[PDB]
Design a protein around this ligand. Sequence first.
Ligand code: A56
Length: 207
Amino acid sequence: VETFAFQAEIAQLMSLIINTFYSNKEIFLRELISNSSDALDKIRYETLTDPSKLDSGKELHINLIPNKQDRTLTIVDTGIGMTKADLINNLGTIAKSGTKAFMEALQAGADISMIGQFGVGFYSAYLVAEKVTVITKHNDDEQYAWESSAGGSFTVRTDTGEPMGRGTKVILHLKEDQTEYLEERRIKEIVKKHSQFIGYPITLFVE
Ligand SMILES: Nc1nc(N)nc(-c2cc3ccccc3cc2Br)n1
């Protein structure tokens, strides 16, 4: 289990989002779903010039899995996934930029709901989660587990759990006053509102 320090800016944006009273929190789901859509595009694009890239899964889709027992909402995709390098880098590199850019955009006006415009929407998850765990498997690399609680650092390890062939799995450990996002009707209501244009199937796994 490796531990890394978030690039300063990133850590800030995180604790900002994590400790800021916002009202349009529901937009976090749109941000995560967006990423998965993009992750799906990539994996697909690579297939157009190489079918083998799909020997790890020919199905391109997104899955929403609420779990009242663990108080966790999980967004799962079968996209490109991330290599340990990309996992560590992507959530410790690009952000130093986007993250700062977006924070500057906040003081300059813009509201939290625009975060996605700065290629760092992912972090909006901390609006409704106290801890976020990321599981990913890239065609080349192995299955890793990224995790952080906006403490300034994050940890990466090899995921022992359930194998997934290919794709990314974002596990949101919801905050106490945010369990409303484990309600089928609510999730469904949100997806219809901000993600009615995703080109990939989105399945909701009720309990
Ligand atoms: N679903 C998904 N697929 C891929 N490839 N990457 C992401 C992803 C991108 C990010 C880009 C910038 C900052 C954080 C990110 C966190 C994740 Br978890 N999410």
